[PDB]
Amino acid sequence: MRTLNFNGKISTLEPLTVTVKNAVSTSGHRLPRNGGFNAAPYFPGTSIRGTLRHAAHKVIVDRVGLNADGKSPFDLAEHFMLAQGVDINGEAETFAPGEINAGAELRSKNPLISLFGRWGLSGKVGIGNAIPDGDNQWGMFGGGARSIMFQRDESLMEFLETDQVDRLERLLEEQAEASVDISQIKTEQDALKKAMKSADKDTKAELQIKVRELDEKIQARKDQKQESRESIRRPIDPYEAFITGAELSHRMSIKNATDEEAGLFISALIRFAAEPRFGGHANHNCGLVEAHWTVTTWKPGELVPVTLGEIVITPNGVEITGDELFAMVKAFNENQSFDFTA
Amino acid sequence: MRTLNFNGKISTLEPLTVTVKNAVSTSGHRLPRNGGFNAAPYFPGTSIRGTLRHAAHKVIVDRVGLNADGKSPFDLAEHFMLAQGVDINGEAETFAPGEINAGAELRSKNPLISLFGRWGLSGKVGIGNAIPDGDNQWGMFGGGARSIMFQRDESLMEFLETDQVDRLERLLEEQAEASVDISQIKTEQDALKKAMKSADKDTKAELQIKVRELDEKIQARKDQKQESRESIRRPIDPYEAFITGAELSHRMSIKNATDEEAGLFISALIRFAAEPRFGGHANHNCGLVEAHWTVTTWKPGELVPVTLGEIVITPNGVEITGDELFAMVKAFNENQSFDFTA
Amino acid sequence: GKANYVSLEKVRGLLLMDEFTDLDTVKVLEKLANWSKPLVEFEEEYGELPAQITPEMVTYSIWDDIQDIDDIRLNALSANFIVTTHAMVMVDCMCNHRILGDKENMYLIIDEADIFVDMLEVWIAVNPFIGMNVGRYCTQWRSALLTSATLSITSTPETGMEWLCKALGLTSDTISIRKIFSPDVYGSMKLTIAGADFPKVFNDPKEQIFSGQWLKAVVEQLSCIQGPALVLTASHYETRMIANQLGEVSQPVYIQKAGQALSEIIKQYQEKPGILISAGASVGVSPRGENGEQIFQDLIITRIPFLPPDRMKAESLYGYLKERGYSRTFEAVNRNIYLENLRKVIRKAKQSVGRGIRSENDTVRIIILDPRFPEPTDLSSKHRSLEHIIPVRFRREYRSCEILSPAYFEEDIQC
Amino acid sequence: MLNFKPYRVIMSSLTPVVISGIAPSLDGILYEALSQAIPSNEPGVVLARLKEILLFNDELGVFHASSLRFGITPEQGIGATTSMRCDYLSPEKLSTAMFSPRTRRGLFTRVLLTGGPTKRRMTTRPAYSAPYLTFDFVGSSEAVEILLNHAHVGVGYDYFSAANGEFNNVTILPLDIDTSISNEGMALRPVPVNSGLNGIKGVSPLIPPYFVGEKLNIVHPAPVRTQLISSLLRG
DNA sequence: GGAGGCCAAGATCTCAATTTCGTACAAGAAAT
DNA sequence: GACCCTTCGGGAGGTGCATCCCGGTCTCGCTTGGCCTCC
């Protein structure tokens, strides 16, 4: 068992963005911040870890074998336990505290669960956050605005029947009237939210009620729009993302990694390199990354770690250089004693 | 017999978090604050002390090694004596309580117990809290959400048979039903919290007991779910951690230390640098640290520090500096007198 | 320099002829041709200073060099107590192997070494840790003595001089001594500091706008002074805004124009003491009178001279630590540079306070109008180091001080 | 043997302070610090060297070192926190790599962490988290500053193990009146009952370490005492 | 066939609730 | 083979629209006998 540290950089091919419920607020979309509003945003280790765990789950599904017409020989409980560590059945063998070698048999038979952990079983893999290199390297990408297709180019209107043209007329008049009414209501709402700043606690209750009621008024005003519930033409709030070519330092660790588990992890990185996507806004191709990792193992009691090799994920291929990385991959590919079932 | 004071900085390679029962409330996971929420949090010296005691125990077991049978020579009693410090078999040297300097035989024979005491025997290693130097060096990390794997990627639905695509449809319908029910139950619960705010005292106790009945009703609705038990589309609460690259100031000290005990401590530090992990959330690689410690000592007979060397733990290696530190480490390594047993 | 930074082949320009009818001290014209000696005594001879300024004698050999300049270097070398500028001691060790040879005949004494370091990072930069170089230089001599009035951040030697222990690379083992010597009875000092409530200095610092409320408060406190005072602002821009906002109700206001020379305002101020608003300046100077006496009972440090944030330094140091291999985040480097700038801020404000007292009989009223100066009672303030500008011997007066705009001055019943 | 002035030392509290019934006295902190500086567990030598840096009241048998008094600011005050020591039986601690558990049928007998002598000890201890800790003492300022800044001493209980009461930014300021033993008849430290100082009766030794020697009847101040930081800096 | 070794029950409950560091000047050169 | 002499003034916008919603966990800090294997 070796402790492998993948220390390396994620270069950004297309902006790297993520919406975490914690970070974002009503002020707009913000990246998860390194402890403060005026801090360097980091790409969370949670998103990277989930992407790699799903890549490893697909690696396992491929490695066992797609039988039938592509259906994998795994139930839904197994897929959830392998990819998210949640047992829907509850039949997962909960290791009562104090159990010696907790899950050692499960770790030996399920290298994936050993790597990415479960409830009551520590995951050997720790996927750290990707911290950017240098000031800036983040920006408000996306954005823009929905425009009515038929108000932009008139040729598409030759493809619309008369009744559909009158439908568009009614839809736009409805959008305008709803916009004016909702905007007046929102002006009242933001004046009320300005009255928050005069924060007398006794008033705050009456203001939260008097603003959530005005937001229900907004919802009801939208609900009576026969043609379109939502205004079709509207500016898109931009999302904060790491710019293209941004260098994000990444640290990943596998504690006490067997050659089988480390080979599974390297195969997960290999399959991730096919679709090296991190985060969301994949409609704008956000998340495409090329990443290079230096694998260094550290024998405990030795003052220095030794370098096993380098994993380079690039659009031109995966360069896994190093005798020990290939040894790990071959050992994982050649071990037939993994039970991923219940 | 020199008091080695190690003073130095821990730089946080990946966020440094810890769960403490008092610090964590229903409002969310917060670091220990030593005051209110506006105070500066500290990484407890207890977690670092436990980590270094575990590292020292690993050093001791490796130095002892295994028997000819391939089993560790330590039993449960000795293992808990060296790890937790509490006597389980009731067989320990109960020194007189008025003898400050007692246990010299046990201290010499067991340097681990000498550094980190057992019950009834004061230890000699005092670890401090990692005190941050800045003002905005902590934040809500992790969190995110446990996205349903099949609602995110559709490629993962080409690997499920229909009998499991219907178990997926049933588990999502169960999740939505249960979340609606729990939503209305929590709404009634919060209205009851409001009536506790009133505390008219006519029937406040009964209002509390019906709140308890409501939590039981939450657990009943959450046992009616017969496919899953927990909602899988769970927003993960963020945990509070020290930002990446946070300079935390650390004081450790071995008081009245033999060269053997100090060498054992330095070997524990060297082995800890193999996996320099403090605290939890190791799934997100949290706790990876690099730390430089200036090892000073007190001049014999005066109140002056003399610097003996530096212990620079980095991912690139452990840089022990100073000839006296090497002398201590060699003295601990070479001494064939330790009997880590009864 | 080179004589008074001059040459000898081309002195004939400033000999007698019609081109300039200076006349007056005609003797100088003929003696200066063979006046090998440096600038200072020129003044001791005469104050006239004819032929207009002649700061560098209407230009001389800025980098073109002179002939037989060696003789001046020899006159320095064989002379026992060599007095130079910090410029010569760094050119010697960076420019070329060694400008001035030495082997057991020379002993660096870097006085005001604090600014000898603070300027070191500007030459090219300390992005590659150029400091290390000069550190070996101090070692290479028999002994280098780095002293300063502000060679400390704290009153403790080994905690406060660690910026010297960490910038030049000299360490305890090779450090001969690390000590602070402060007199106990040296002068007197009344401290008045602006509290937390005091109006914020910068409404918006980035684009350098000074909040009008702070300007009004500062002019108000300036006009309340009943005697000559020395106002040490931080920027000449602050000097200009404060001069604009002042109505000159007080005795003559003397202003340091951007890029002016302080000594002209000094001698403007000796003839008629008044209120002197002079940003920058200082560098170890004092508007002392003719025989020598404290001619400004008040010294107003409007704002602590906080150094701007320097993205160039942050990105350069991050580049060097990324090529060297250290795994530190950019934010950590930003914090390190911020702390180093805070240390240089404390040193600069220690120089500012040193401009108040220069004799044992001096009695100075120090007026800090900055709302960010730590109050005595606010020990958890971010800038808690900033009371180290005050000497230890006046720290009682720091603890017993007048606060103009204090905060939470009520009585809390949960005592 | 050295001249001694009345000083007040105020330190920024970094960790909650577990008070062991009697308020931690500054002489006990200084006795731990000198027990480290000159490595010595023998009380006599450490006491002798403490007398060289701290004034010792012969007529009372106590050091001129007042008990802990929390300095509370208008922003942060004295708070009730719990110093919580929990045993963490990690999966690596519960592994055959470290120890040989008793075996039956190849199954390793799990450790009963719920109860028993091998349980997960959850030791909660009242701690007080105030922004500042202040002590009054009569002694050498440089020596006490050096000890408090560059020694592993905290305030309260189990700082050598639980790192409770870690402090930094030690500021020593001279006092005009000795408020280390007595203040208007109110005891500011553990004093003997015969001293005539009124306070809270208790059983303790007078001189440090406060867990050895015969524990005699003493009068000690309120274990938790709070003062405004402004009033403490007034001097 | 008496020693482990795992597992279920014991009735009660205290209480606490958050919105963004630092903004410059010099003086002085035998040069990189 | 020496200078000449360096231009004005205009005029600087208008609108539209700012989404829907999930879904917030297990624990456990103790002791005892009952039952089940089993040296």
Q: How far apart are CA C252 and CA C270, in angstroms?
A: 12
- Both tokens assigned to B31: 């670091």
DSSP helix/strand/coil, C209 = strand
* Spacing of C-alpha B299 from chain mean position: 35
Question: D16 CA to chain A: closest CA distance, Å?
Answer: 23
Contacts of C322 in chain A (CB under 8 A): 133
Q: How far apart are CA C402 and CA B158, in angstroms?
A: 77
- Asked if residue B234 keeps its beta carbon closer than 7 A to nucleic acid strand F, the reply is yes
| CB C102 within 8 Å of CB C141 | yes
Q: Following DSSP, what letter does each residue of B124-161 receive, concatenated? A: SEEE--BEESSSS-EEEEE------HHHH-SGGGTTS-
Q: DSSP state, A283?
A: G
Pairing of strands A2-12, A138-141: unpaired
DSSP helix/strand/coil, A131 = strand
Q: How far apart are CA D95 and CA B246, in angstroms?
A: 33
Residue entry with tokens 């403007």: C268
Phi, psi angle pair for B8, to nearest 5°: 175, -175
How many angstroms separate the Cα of D82 from the Cα of each of B25, D40, D69, D77? Answer: 13, 32, 19, 16
Contacts of A133 in chain C (CB under 8 A): 318, 322, 330
H or E segment and range at residue D118 = none
Return the residue of C nearest to B12 by Cα: C328
| CB A86 within 8 Å of CB D97 | no
Q: Name the residue among D219, B159, C259, C215 with its Cα closest to residue A69.
A: B159
HSE-up of D231 (CA within 13 Å, CB side)?
Answer: 15
| Side chain identity, residue A118 | R
D107 forms beta bridges with: D104
Q: How far apart are CA D194 and CA D235, in angstroms?
A: 29
Q: How far apart are CA D5 and CA C405, in angstroms?
A: 34
Residue D167: CB atoms within 10 A of its CB come to 23
Taking an 8 Å cut-off on Cβ atoms, the answer to whether B236 and A54 are in contact is no
Q: How far apart are CA D83 and CA D71, in angstroms?
A: 20
- Give the total residue count for chain A: 342
Nucleotide closest in space to B151 (CA vs C1'): F22
Q: Name the residue among C344, C277, C331 with its Cα closest to residue C304.
A: C344
Q: How far apart are CA C110 and CA C135, in angstroms?
A: 12
Q: How far apart are CA A163 and CA C94, in angstroms?
A: 84
Q: DSSP state, A67?
A: B
Return the residue of B nearest to D41 by Cα: B101
Task: Using a 7 Å CB cutoff, list residues 200-259 of A near strand F.
Answer: 219, 230-231, 233-237
CA torsion sign for C305, C311, C312, C314 is positive
Q: DSSP state, C415?
A: -
| Burial label, B90 (beta-carbon count in 10 A; 0-12, 13-18, 19+) | exposed
Q: How far apart are CA A221 and CA A204, in angstroms?
A: 25
| CB B111 within 8 Å of CB B339 | no
How many angstroms separate the Cα of A13 from the Cα of each of A285, A294, B204, D199? Answer: 9, 20, 60, 72
HSE-up of B95 (CA within 13 Å, CB side)?
Answer: 17
Q: How far apart are CA C381 and CA C93, in angstroms?
A: 42
Nucleotide closest in space to A197 (CA vs C1'): E19
Peptide bond into D209 cis (omega under 30): yes
Number of helices (H), then strands (E), belonging to chain D: the values are 5, 16
How many angstroms separate the Cα of C385 from the Cα of each of C235, C367, C373? Answer: 22, 18, 9
CA torsion sign for A254, A257, A263, A268 is negative
Q: How far apart are CA B277 and CA C116, in angstroms?
A: 42
Q: Following DSSP, what letter does each residue of B31-51 receive, concatenated? A: ---SSSTTSPP-B-HHHHHHH
Q: Is A260 left (phi over 0), alpha (psi -120 to 50) or beta?
A: alpha
- Both tokens assigned to C379: 């020990």
Interface test with C, best of D230, D231, D232, D234 (most C CBs within 10 A): D230
B317 vs C: CB within 8 A: no
DSSP helix/strand/coil, C76 = helix
- Both tokens assigned to B184: 């209305």
CA of A152 and C1' of F11: distance in angstroms?
30
* C381 Cβ neighbours under 8 A, 6+ residues apart: C374, C375
Pairing of strands C402-403, C188-193: parallel
Pairing of strands B131-132, A317-321: unpaired
- Both tokens assigned to B97: 């309580």
Give the end-to-end CA distance of chain B in Å, rounded to a whole number.
25
| CB D221 within 8 Å of CB D189 | yes
* B202 Cβ neighbours under 8 A, 6+ residues apart: none
| CB A19 within 8 Å of CB A28 | no
- Asked if residue B140 keeps its beta carbon closer than 7 A to nucleic acid strand F, the reply is no
Q: How far apart are CA A334 and CA A325, in angstroms?
A: 14
Chain breaks in chain B (C to N over 2.5 A) after: none
Q: How far apart are CA A142 and CA A239, in angstroms?
A: 6
Phi, psi angle pair for D28, to nearest 5°: -65, -40
Pairing of strands C229-231, C298-301: parallel
| CB D41 within 8 Å of CB C383 | no
| Side chain identity, residue C394 | F
Q: DSSP state, A188?
A: H
Taking an 8 Å cut-off on Cβ atoms, the answer to whether A97 and D91 are in contact is no
Interface test with B, best of A20, A43, A125, A255 (most B CBs within 10 A): A20
What is the C-alpha radius of gyration for chain A, rounded to an integer number of angstroms?
26
* A253 Cβ neighbours under 8 A, 6+ residues apart: A3, A4, A5, A6, A125, A126, A128, B275, B277, B282, B285, B288
CA torsion sign for B206, B208, B214, B220 is negative
- Asked if residue B172 keeps its beta carbon closer than 7 A to nucleic acid strand F, the reply is yes
CA dihedral B106, B112, B117, B123 (to 10 degrees): 90
DSSP helix/strand/coil, B163 = helix
Q: How far apart are CA A325 and CA A264, in angstroms?
A: 11
PDB experimental method: cryo-EM
Residue entry with tokens 């050997």: A124
Instruction: Please give the angle made by the CA atoms of D217, D221 and D222, to the nearest 5 degrees.
Output: 120
- Both tokens assigned to C59: 């230009």
Q: How far apart are CA A260 and CA A1, in angstroms?
A: 10
Residue entry with tokens 């939890």: B280
- Both tokens assigned to C275: 């209120």
Phi, psi angle pair for C209, to nearest 5°: -115, 125
C202 forms beta bridges with: C210
HSE-up of C350 (CA within 13 Å, CB side)?
Answer: 25
Q: How far apart are CA C139 and CA C93, in angstroms?
A: 12
| Side chain identity, residue C326 | Y
| CB C196 within 8 Å of CB C407 | yes
Q: How far apart are CA A56 and CA A123, in angstroms?
A: 13
Nucleotide closest in space to D104 (CA vs C1'): F38
Q: How far apart are CA B17 and CA B35, in angstroms?
A: 18
Q: How far apart are CA B299 and CA B297, in angstroms?
A: 6
DSSP helix/strand/coil, A310 = strand
| CB C160 within 8 Å of CB C385 | no
Q: How far apart are CA B184 and CA B182, in angstroms?
A: 6
| CB C392 within 8 Å of CB C155 | yes
Residue B95: CB atoms within 10 A of its CB come to 15
How many angstroms separate the Cα of A112 from the Cα of each of A79, A82, A106, C211? Answer: 11, 7, 10, 60
DSSP helix/strand/coil, B289 = strand
